[PDB]
Ligand binder design. Structure first.
Ligand SMILES: CC(=O)N[C@H]1[C@@H](OP(=O)(O)O)O[C@H](CO)[C@@H](O)[C@@H]1O
Ligand SMILES: OCCc1ccc(O)cc1
Ligand SMILES: OCCc1ccc(O)cc1
Ligand SMILES: OCCc1ccc(O)cc1
Length: 472
């Protein structure tokens, strides 16, 4: 393990930085525990931690709805354009130019599962997990693309996890044989962490030999794409277009060809999907403009007066209603610039009850009130680095595209039951549109049968008894 000299040099750095309390219990640690503490502390720069704590604890507009050059809506689109963008998106898939990054490092504190959120079974007839439904969407788009190329189509799946989720995620994917995808085209990687900070700016000790850390927010994606090797893998594959999304949306149109096609046609660096906000209290970030710059306002920071503000000309409708649904497109060229701006991203403060050592006794205690803060970066904080002309915000239909799993069963909204209803409602609607008659709520349609409502003609004239599950 670490030499005395190495350990003293580390101790000097931390002590000079006013963080020498992290070594309060060194004299009683076992060799292994001492090693852990050494390596963990070596992984942070205590001066940087001080810089972050200082900005957090002693912190240092032109703020209207997005302009019309920057916005589009599926509702207002010419159907011939939607068809063309879909075809162009599928051609890019067939070209092996499309990748997916899945943000699955969330805890799911509101959901109360012990397992990764992606593993959750919302109670469909199939009992498929969120991960498996997403994987099957990828499989299906590959198969559709192969129809046009006559060659293998691969959409690599890069799954970002946290330390709370990485091992069980990999085990789950392995036990399912990667849901019929090739393991060689799925990479599970971890996002980074930052130390939790006390109200007084001091690093919190989880144990006598471990610093309390937390994942660094979904904005941690960008640094993690470099350190993980993922960006290099995309380069080696000739990836040009990336779809990034959150695991909790059970209706997510993974690698949606119309989205990719549209974004690519406009040659944007970034595109993003929104829906109309369902009310002033919905826990969604709101996409709007700031200071000549596309930007977002998170639900945890917005002020009542803006969440409740009304449209100038229509006083019964909310002014800000472009709910961020965490559904983003990037050019690969954008990812090649990460190094120039990853350090420019802000840290957002969240005050938290961080279980730690009673700084004295060494007794582990869950505190009664918030004893410190976690810092997080947010994926959308790149939007202001991007010229308005290299940005697109598209309205899509909530009932087809956005059904988040946030809360435990019995909450009443954004829960397993709303998720299940939304998928099975989608299924029924697709069947009906293809000429099927459903007798009854709803019908689960496997993604391997239909990605987006296509391919259901074989049900024309048929009677389907709901609840049902259409599969192989
Ligand atoms: C940083 C980030 O991506 N935040 C997202 C994300 O919030 P959560 O706090 O992870 O629930 O999901 C919302 C949609 O469910 C979206 O509106 C919001 O902006
Ligand atoms: O618990 C004794 C360790 C300690 C060291 C430095 C400080 O500033 C405070 C506490
Ligand atoms: O980057 C994480 C550094 C780290 C190293 C060793 C540990 O035992 C724990 C954390
Ligand atoms: O004009 C908007 C076209 C459009 C529709 C749906 C998407 O997902 C993306 C773009």
């Amino acid at each position: 393990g670490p030499s005395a000299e190495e350990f003293q040099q580390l101790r000097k750095k931390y002590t000079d930085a006013g963080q020498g309390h992290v070594f309060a219990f060194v004299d009683e640690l076992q060799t292994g525990e001492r090693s852990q503490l050494f390596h963990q502390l070596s992984s942070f720069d205590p001066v940087r931690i001080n810089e972050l704590a200082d900005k957090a604890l002693n912190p240092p507009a032109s703020l209207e709805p997005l302009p019309d050059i920057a916005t589009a809506s599926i509702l207002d689109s010419d159907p011939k354009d939607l068809e063309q963008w879909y075809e162009e998106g599928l051609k890019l898939v067939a070209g092996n130019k499309v990748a997916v990054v899945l943000m699955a490092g969330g805890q799911g504190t509101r959901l109360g599962s012990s397992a990764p959120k992606g593993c959750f079974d919302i109670g469909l007839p199939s009992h498929k997990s969120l991960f498996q439904i997403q994987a099957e969407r990828i499989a299906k788009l590959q198969l559709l693309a192969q129809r046009i190329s006559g060659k293998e189509a691969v959409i690599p799946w890069y799954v970002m996890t946290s330390g709370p989720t990485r091992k069980p995620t990999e085990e789950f994917f392995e036990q399912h044989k990667y849901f019929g995808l090739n393991k060689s085209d799925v990479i599970i990687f971890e996002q980074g962490v930052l130390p939790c900070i006390s109200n007084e700016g001091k690093i919190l000790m989880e144990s006598k030999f471990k610093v309390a850390v937390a994942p660094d927010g979904n904005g941690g994606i960008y640094q993690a794409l470099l350190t993980s090797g993922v960006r290099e893998d995309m380069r080696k594959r000739g990836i040009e277009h990336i779809h990034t999304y959150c695991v909790d949306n059970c209706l997510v149109k993974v690698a949606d060809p119309v989205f990719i096609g549209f974004a690519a046609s406009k040659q944007v660096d970034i595109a993003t999907k929104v829906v109309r906000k369902r009310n002033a209290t919905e826990s969604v970030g709101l996409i709007l403009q700031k200071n000549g710059k596309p930007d977002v306002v998170e639900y945890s920071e917005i002020d009542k007066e803006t969440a409740e503000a009304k449209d100038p000309k229509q006083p019964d409708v909310l002014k800000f209603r472009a709910a961020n649904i965490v559904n983003h497109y990037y050019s690969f060229k954008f990812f090649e610039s990460i190094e120039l701006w990853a350090h420019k991203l802000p840290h957002h403060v969240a005050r938290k009850k961080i279980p730690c050592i009673k700084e004295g006794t060494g007794e582990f205690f869950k505190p009664e009130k918030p004893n410190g803060i976690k810092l997080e970066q947010f994926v959308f904080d790149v939007f202001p680095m991007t010229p308005l002309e290299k940005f697109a915000c598209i309205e899509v239909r909530r009932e087809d595209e956005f059904s988040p799993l946030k809360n435990a069963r019995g909450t009443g909204e954004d829960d397993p039951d709303t998720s299940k209803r939304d998928i099975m409602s989608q299924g029924q609607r697709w069947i009906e549109k293809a000429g099927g008659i459903v007798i009854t709520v709803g019908v689960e349609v496997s993604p391997l049968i239909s990605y987006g409502g296509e391919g259901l003609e074989f049900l024309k004239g048929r009677e389907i008894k709901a609840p049902a599950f259409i599969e192989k």
